[PDB]
Write a protein that holds these residues in place. Structure first.
Motif, PDB file in Angstrom:
ATOM      1  N   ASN A 125       0.913  -1.224   0.104  1.00 32.12           N
ATOM      2  CA  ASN A 125      -0.039   0.009  -0.163  1.00 32.12           C
ATOM      3  C   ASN A 125       0.754   1.374  -0.051  1.00 32.12           C
ATOM      4  N   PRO A 126       1.556   1.610  -1.158  1.00 34.67           N
ATOM      5  CA  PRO A 126       2.539   2.791  -1.256  1.00 34.67           C
ATOM      6  C   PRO A 126       1.595   4.015  -0.678  1.00 34.67           C
ATOM      7  N   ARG A 127       2.429   4.839  -0.012  1.00 39.31           N
ATOM      8  CA  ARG A 127       1.919   5.883   0.418  1.00 39.31           C
ATOM      9  C   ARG A 127       0.886   5.918   1.517  1.00 39.31           C
ATOM     10  N   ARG A 128       0.499   4.948   1.917  1.00 45.36           N
ATOM     11  CA  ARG A 128      -0.482   4.669   3.095  1.00 45.36           C
ATOM     12  C   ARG A 128      -0.082   4.377   4.369  1.00 45.36           C
ATOM     13  N   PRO A 129      -0.126   5.250   5.351  1.00 47.53           N
ATOM     14  CA  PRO A 129       0.541   4.951   6.743  1.00 47.53           C
ATOM     15  C   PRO A 129      -0.458   3.783   7.434  1.00 47.53           C
ATOM     16  N   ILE A 130       0.495   2.911   8.095  1.00 44.40           N
ATOM     17  CA  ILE A 130      -0.199   1.568   8.458  1.00 44.40           C
ATOM     18  C   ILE A 130       0.240   1.620  10.095  1.00 44.40           C
ATOM     19  N   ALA A 131      -0.688   1.572  11.035  1.00 48.73           N
ATOM     20  CA  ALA A 131      -0.224   1.716  12.425  1.00 48.73           C
ATOM     21  C   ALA A 131      -0.586   0.205  12.979  1.00 48.73           C
ATOM     22  N   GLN A 132       0.409  -0.340  13.710  1.00 50.03           N
ATOM     23  CA  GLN A 132       0.094  -1.598  14.422  1.00 50.03           C
ATOM     24  C   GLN A 132       0.919  -1.594  15.772  1.00 50.03           C
ATOM     25  N   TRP A 133       0.156  -2.427  16.743  1.00 48.41           N
ATOM     26  CA  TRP A 133       0.677  -2.900  17.872  1.00 48.41           C
ATOM     27  C   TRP A 133       1.630  -3.984  17.795  1.00 48.41           C
ATOM     28  N   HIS A 134       2.590  -3.975  18.469  1.00 48.59           N
ATOM     29  CA  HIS A 134       3.713  -5.141  18.584  1.00 48.59           C
ATOM     30  C   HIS A 134       4.090  -5.347  20.005  1.00 48.59           C
ATOM     31  N   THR A 135       4.198  -6.866  20.263  1.00 45.55           N
ATOM     32  CA  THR A 135       4.505  -7.208  21.680  1.00 45.55           C
ATOM     33  C   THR A 135       6.066  -7.129  21.740  1.00 45.55           C
ATOM     34  N   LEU A 136       6.755  -6.454  22.507  1.00 40.09           N
ATOM     35  CA  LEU A 136       8.058  -6.338  22.832  1.00 40.09           C
ATOM     36  C   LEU A 136       8.787  -7.582  23.215  1.00 40.09           C
TER      37      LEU A 136
END
Length: 148
Positions: A125-136
């Motif tokens: 998805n060029p140009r699309r910001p994608i936010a996600q959670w990640h476990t440390l």
């Protein structure tokens, strides 16, 4: 349980611009004696076990649930974006002594699980910001995956 980090990824192929926005961390492990933590976040761009570029956030005081909303950009041309790693580390700041890592994750080449999914979504998805959670994850393990 080390905590969780939320960040966005955005890639623009023509300009070769990779943007990482550190949004927030939660449920961080306590690293201070009788206290909470003073957390900050480091971002490394890596390839083939080498640290290419390093950025870091401001430090938040006395919190296990910091909010940052700090953006960082890297120059990664489209012919290389599939071969890099972005490493995100949360650390506890101490005025004196080596700052201890709480934990870390990486996205990009050789990434796995939800980290691979986040990276793949960015690329698709060029140009699309994608936010996600990640476990440390503990640094010992992540570093072994990133090394030589």
């Amino acid at each position: 349980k080390l905590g969780d980090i939320c960040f966005s990824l955005r890639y623009v192929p023509t300009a070769g611009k990779l943007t990482v926005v550190i949004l927030e961390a939660k449920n961080l492990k306590k690293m201070d004696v009788g206290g909470l933590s003073d957390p900050y976040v480091k971002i490394h761009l890596m390839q083939n076990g080498k640290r290419l570029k390093k950025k870091k956030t401001t430090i938040k005081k006395n919190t296990l649930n910091p909010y940052y909303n700090e953006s960082f950009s890297f120059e990664v041309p489209f012919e290389q974006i599939q071969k890099v790693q972005v490493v995100v580390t949360v650390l506890d700041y101490d005025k004196i002594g080596k700052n201890d890592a709480i934990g870390k994750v990486f996205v990009g080449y050789n990434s796995t699980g939800a980290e691979l999914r986040h990276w793949s979504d960015m690329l698709a998805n060029p140009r699309r910001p994608i936010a996600q959670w990640h476990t440390l994850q503990v640094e010992e393990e992540v570093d072994a995956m990133l090394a030589v």
